[PDB]
Amino acid sequence: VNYPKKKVMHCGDARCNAHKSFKVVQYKAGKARLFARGKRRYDRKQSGYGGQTKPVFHKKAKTTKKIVLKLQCSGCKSIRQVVLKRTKHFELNDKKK
Amino acid sequence: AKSKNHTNHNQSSKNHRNGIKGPVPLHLHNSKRGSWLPALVNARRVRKHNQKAALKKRRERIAAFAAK
Amino acid sequence: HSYGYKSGTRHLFAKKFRKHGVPSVSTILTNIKVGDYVDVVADSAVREGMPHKYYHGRTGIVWNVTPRGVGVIINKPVRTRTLRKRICVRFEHVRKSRCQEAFKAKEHQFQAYLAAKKAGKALPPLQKSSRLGGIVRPKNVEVLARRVADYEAMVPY
Amino acid sequence: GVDLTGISKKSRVIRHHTYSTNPYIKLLIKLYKFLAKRTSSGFNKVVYQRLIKSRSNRAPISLSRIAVVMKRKAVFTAKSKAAPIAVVVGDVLDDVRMARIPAMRVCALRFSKSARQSIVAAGGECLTFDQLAMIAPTGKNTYLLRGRKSGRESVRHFGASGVPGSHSKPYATNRGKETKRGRRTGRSYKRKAFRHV
RNA sequence: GUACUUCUCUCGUACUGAAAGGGAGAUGCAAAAUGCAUCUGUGGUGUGCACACGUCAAAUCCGUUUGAUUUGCCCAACACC
RNA sequence: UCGAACCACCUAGUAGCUGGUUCACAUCGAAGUUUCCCUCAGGAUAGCUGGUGCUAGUAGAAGUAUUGUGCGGUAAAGCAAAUGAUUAGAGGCGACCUAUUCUCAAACUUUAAAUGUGCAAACAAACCGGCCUUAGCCAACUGCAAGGCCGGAAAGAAAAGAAUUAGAGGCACCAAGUGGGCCUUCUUCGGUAAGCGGAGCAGGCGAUGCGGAAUGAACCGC
RNA sequence: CCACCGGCCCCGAAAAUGGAUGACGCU
RNA sequence: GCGCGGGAGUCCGCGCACCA
RNA sequence: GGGCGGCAUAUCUGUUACACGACAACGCAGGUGUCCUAAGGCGAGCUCAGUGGGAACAGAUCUCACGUAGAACACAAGCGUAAAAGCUUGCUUGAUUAACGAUUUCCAGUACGAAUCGAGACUGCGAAAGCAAGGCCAGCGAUCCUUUGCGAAGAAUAGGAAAUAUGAACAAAUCAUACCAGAGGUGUCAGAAUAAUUACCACAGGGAUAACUGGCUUGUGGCGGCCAAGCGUUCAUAGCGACGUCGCUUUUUGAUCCUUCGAUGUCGGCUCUUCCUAACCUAGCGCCGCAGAAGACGCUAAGGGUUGGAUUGUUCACC
Ligand SMILES: [K+]
Ligand SMILES: [K+]
Ligand SMILES: [K+]
Ligand SMILES: [Mg+2]
Ligand SMILES: [Mg+2]
Ligand SMILES: [Mg+2]
Ligand SMILES: [Mg+2]
Ligand SMILES: [Mg+2]
Ligand SMILES: [Mg+2]
Ligand SMILES: [Mg+2]
Ligand SMILES: [Mg+2]
Ligand SMILES: [Mg+2]
Ligand SMILES: [Mg+2]
Ligand SMILES: [Mg+2]
Ligand SMILES: [Mg+2]
Ligand SMILES: [Mg+2]
Ligand SMILES: [Mg+2]
Ligand SMILES: [Mg+2]
Ligand SMILES: [Mg+2]
Ligand SMILES: [Mg+2]
Ligand SMILES: [Mg+2]
Ligand SMILES: [Mg+2]
Ligand SMILES: [Mg+2]
Ligand SMILES: [Mg+2]
Ligand SMILES: [Mg+2]
Ligand SMILES: [Mg+2]
Ligand SMILES: [Mg+2]
Ligand SMILES: [Mg+2]
Ligand SMILES: [Mg+2]
Ligand SMILES: [Mg+2]
Ligand SMILES: [Mg+2]
Ligand SMILES: [Mg+2]
Ligand SMILES: [Mg+2]
Ligand SMILES: [Mg+2]
Ligand SMILES: [Mg+2]
Ligand SMILES: [Mg+2]
Ligand SMILES: [Mg+2]
Ligand SMILES: [Mg+2]
Ligand SMILES: [Mg+2]
Ligand SMILES: [Mg+2]
Ligand SMILES: [Mg+2]
Ligand SMILES: [Mg+2]
Ligand SMILES: [Mg+2]
Ligand code: NA
Ligand code: NA
Ligand SMILES: [Zn+2]
DSSP, rough: EEEEEEEEEEEEOOOTSSSSEEEEEOOOOOOOOTTTTTHHHHHHHHSSSOOOOSSSOOOOOOEEEEEEEEEEEHHHOOOOEEEEEEOOOEEEOOOOO | OOOOOOOSHHHHHHTTTTTOOOOOOOOOOOOOOSSSSSHHHHHHHHHHHHHHHHHHHHHHHHHHOOOO | OOOOOTTTTTSSOOTTTOOSSSSOOHHHHHOOOOOEEEEOOOOOOOOOOOGGGGGEEEEEEEEESSSEEEEEEEEEEEEEEEEEEEEEEEEGGGEOOOOOOOHHHHHHHHHHHHHHHHTTTOOOOOOSSSSSSHHHHHHOOOOOOOOHHHTTTOOOO | OOOOTGGGGOOOOOOOOOOOOOOOHHHHHHHHHHHHOOOHHHHHHHHHHHSSSGGGGGEEEEEEHHHHHHHHHHEEEOOOOOOEEEOOOOEEOOOTOOOOOOEEEEEEEEOHHHHHHHHHHHHHHOOHHHHHHHHHOOOEEEEEEEEOOOTOOOHHHOOOOOSOOOOOOOOOEEEEEEETTSSTTTOOOOOOSOOOO
């Protein structure tokens, strides 16, 4: 699948309220940080002699992932997220051919 | 071991034992929620006016009755 | 195996022979208002706002009107009770129902008779039953019997 | 044999005697059964049936409600006629939300002490059913009243709270426990508040 | 065992929001980003015991009964606002 | 006493599995089906049943007709009509075209039943002329749309085959058993067939004797 | 006197303990 | 996901690490 | 039966399916975990598959006429479509947001997936009426946990119509957490984190379920009948009989799963009795392609007989 590098869509900001040009980037998940509340609880439980205390997923079935795009406006420093369907190869091209 | 898969043999008899009840008449549960909004809003303004007229009508009946 | 939305509609959602085509202008100019009786008959050439196959051929009451759509209330039996289902369809899939044509004619005739009686006009004569007796004068009389030729003409070979 | 299929389904469950253990209730039942049998008024028959009924079906009434309904009836009554007697087969309870009431004649199975004091102070009278049977044997010029039954906690609990269009309360002791999944759109789904019937 | 007792404690008379927090009458005049005035009062409509006012039937031992219905207020309750 | 000795204790270990479960009359009386479950010898859930009622006791009724008005593609029929098969002769001219001709289709059809299935058949409704309101429609309104008020009429539904009822409607609360079925009549799918396996409509046995077919759970009568 | 096609009957029609229109029997 | 090598990406090897 | 095999485990079209709807099988014929910035949106202009007559190379391209769709719409199938829903072209991003509006399909009238009718914002195309919030209808995912986006700067003598909240003795800056909307996945698809062997074996049960006898059936096996093309040097039937077609039997193997799993002792031989006839010998007949002798093919007939040994556990087989 090919996607354009820029889109024109409704901004929605109170100071714009009109169609403007956005820059397209692909979302990527951030690093799992220490000292997150769930991570702290997991580390406390794992310490000791019990062994493995939580399930570990093994039998994966999916071969794709949904695509999330981050759109940034130049006029207003705001970001919007948009979801596309599942695909095996996502590329950004302005060639339009 | 294998068993029966599916059947509908006795179901009609069960449904008619306490009968198949009829529908609710049309003048009950006739809510207008979800209908075309512009017509809904205009009808609300008329109903508000009618309630004020109903209150005024009762006051006149009371005064006339007291005057005999 | 498969239980899709439009399963088993090969002959149900099809046009009659030499009667294909999109809806005409009479359908577009028909007026529908809340409280009317309509028949839900799917038009297979529109493919927008089509009712489910169950409601094809049912008669109901209009409860909502939108710019291009109509809301209809349809009775549907489920187990031991009857449900009033509200469906949303495009205006091209409904038509005005004649299910009360006879009853409306009955009321109008009664009003006309009432007016004539008050005006002192002449009421029409009353029909008489055909199940009464009487004299019959025959014009042509024939004998009914089984003939030999009847059996011979029953062996096509 | 005779084809009487499904004939037991036309039978109706009605109580013919009281379950009460109160001898005074039994005496009242005797008196009003006699009156209902030997008179031609619907008032006596209704009173007899309500006396037969059970405690949960004899909900109490409020003095303020009595006053409001009496006023709404009296506004359209000729000034040359006397006000009717309010009759309740049940209990009458006082109301702190209303302080000023007119003089009324009320007959009931039982009065609370506050209600009796309020009625007497306003200038009315509290009557019993034996006094009523002598004052008006056929129930002429009366006003039969009933108490409110909806609004009870049991009624508010009746039904399943997890189906669309339902607003019944669940059986739970911890108020903050049964939130989240199934009650908020952010947690999987939310029970729909409205549904066409 | 029975007789007696105070404060207190508990369930309830008010709920809602994640939380900081906030918190429910009616009518009239009016249209104020906390408006003003009165307090004997169902917020409104439809369907609704008994009672009151009439009318019509059938029966009558002629005293009255049994059914319908009109109007008023409608109790409990249901539906739509 | 040994593919992990013996003694006491945790231990009355757990068991969706097997066995048992103590008086009498009376009023009522089923299910082996739906959905979800590491679910298939088990549960939860709806249905069938009992108890308790509430409400103005003929009400918002019906496993049935009639009349009016909608829906349909099975049985039958057809190949001289579209799709797909298929035998032979003839004319024009070996091939082809032209009309024919013989036999057909669960995944073919122009046409099209019988049995079905939806709605309606005057009392919170419908019909006929005032008035009030709307921030609805239309260039406007005294036109259309909507909610009300006032007034009238009302075989309360005639006549033409022109319904009938052992015809009180509606609304709740609490809870059991069951969730292995089997047989027959018509319609059927797999199989050479089966007292074989799997379905649709209805009636039965299960849960039921009695009178008949000598004898038989299901046949005939009741 | 020849062909054709119906009723009832007969041939076609062979098993394992002695036996079954229910038994005797019935023309 | 981490380190190495052979405008960035892509590919290939090694050795590491796994709560939906 | 179980195992091996295969998914009938989530799901789509045609048929089974009995002219409303619903309806099963490890029934039949086939599909799905993708693909597309255009193959989405709109306006305009054209008419497809094929056939016939013509034009150097040319036995590709040009021209005229006919052409109800016999073409094409990403993919399986059904339906639908002709100044279009197909082909070409021009401009675009309605594949955005969408105040917790209502509804359909499954259905417990729960959710998920998919779909329908709407109200508000900003737009696209078009002269305009209008059309469009993906490619109609299969193409997908809960709690907990992780992770991303919006609570822009300015202003209130106050927390208000209008300033996101908390870390509970107070205040500042970090850090953590909370409320709303998405993403990382559970294909056993309403969602545990999982390799073998037991002939040394154990327990609770099951005739809801196999191995052996019985029962239904008779495909297979074994016995017959009817017609008559041929063989028989001649001659259909002395003796045979193809191509077809009808039956019988339960001494073979299959098919099923009704009885028995708190037990019906299981292959063969030895011993001993009895029954059947589809007749090898013994008793009578008939007929041959019967000169005699030796034989063949039938009918009545089950009264009486039907052996000794080598190899093999054998039954069977062979000498
Ligand atoms: K199907
Ligand atoms: K706030
Ligand atoms: K066998
Ligand atoms: Mg079962
Ligand atoms: Mg309350
Ligand atoms: Mg004190
Ligand atoms: Mg409370
Ligand atoms: Mg609080
Ligand atoms: Mg909040
Ligand atoms: Mg030893
Ligand atoms: Mg025990
Ligand atoms: Mg034990
Ligand atoms: Mg189990
Ligand atoms: Mg037992
Ligand atoms: Mg009974
Ligand atoms: Mg699971
Ligand atoms: Mg058992
Ligand atoms: Mg046919
Ligand atoms: Mg035909
Ligand atoms: Mg044909
Ligand atoms: Mg008539
Ligand atoms: Mg069971
Ligand atoms: Mg079976
Ligand atoms: Mg049983
Ligand atoms: Mg019987
Ligand atoms: Mg017999
Ligand atoms: Mg015999
Ligand atoms: Mg015989
Ligand atoms: Mg006999
Ligand atoms: Mg059907
Ligand atoms: Mg066009
Ligand atoms: Mg909603
Ligand atoms: Mg959804
Ligand atoms: Mg819009
Ligand atoms: Mg997710
Ligand atoms: Mg700010
Ligand atoms: Mg599942
Ligand atoms: Mg060994
Ligand atoms: Mg068995
Ligand atoms: Mg056994
Ligand atoms: Mg035994
Ligand atoms: Mg034995
Ligand atoms: Mg034994
Ligand atoms: Na599962
Ligand atoms: Na057989
Ligand atoms: Zn902006």
